[PDB]
Amino acid sequence: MSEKIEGIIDDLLNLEENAHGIAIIGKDGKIITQTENWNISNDLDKLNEFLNEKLAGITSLSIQGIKYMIVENTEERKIGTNITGKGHVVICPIPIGGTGALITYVNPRAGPRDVLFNVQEYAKKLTDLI
């Protein structure tokens, strides 16, 4: 963790109104940082399993007791939506198809595709820092 990474996250949160939570997984599979409104620590093994699964598949992912149905899975972005109104999650691998990730909890009132432009770009900003 660094203040450079903290600066990037703060910039993303101020820029992207529908980013309601952030977590970063380092290239080693460990949590670098996360926003204080959630904790993904007890779900890290399942998150890493999903992040690193090769496609040619995992259909749901639970984070902190919220079940997300997987509606999109590429090397660039993986999207889960809770279907009881609890929100969405967007996982952007760092690098594309890699072992690090920028994870965004998405405002329940938004669609998860709404944050993609910003989160995919900010994932690329973290390439050399994680």
Curated annotation (Swiss-Prot):
GO terms for cellular component: cytoplasm; cytoskeleton. One of its GO terms (molecular function) is actin binding. It comes from Lokiarchaeum sp. (strain GC14_75). Keywords: Actin-binding, Cytoplasm, Cytoskeleton. This is Loki profilin-1. Belongs to the Asgard profilin family. The keyword Cytoplasm applies. The Loki loop (specific to some members) becomes ordered on binding to rabbit actin. InterPro entries: PFN, PFN_sf.
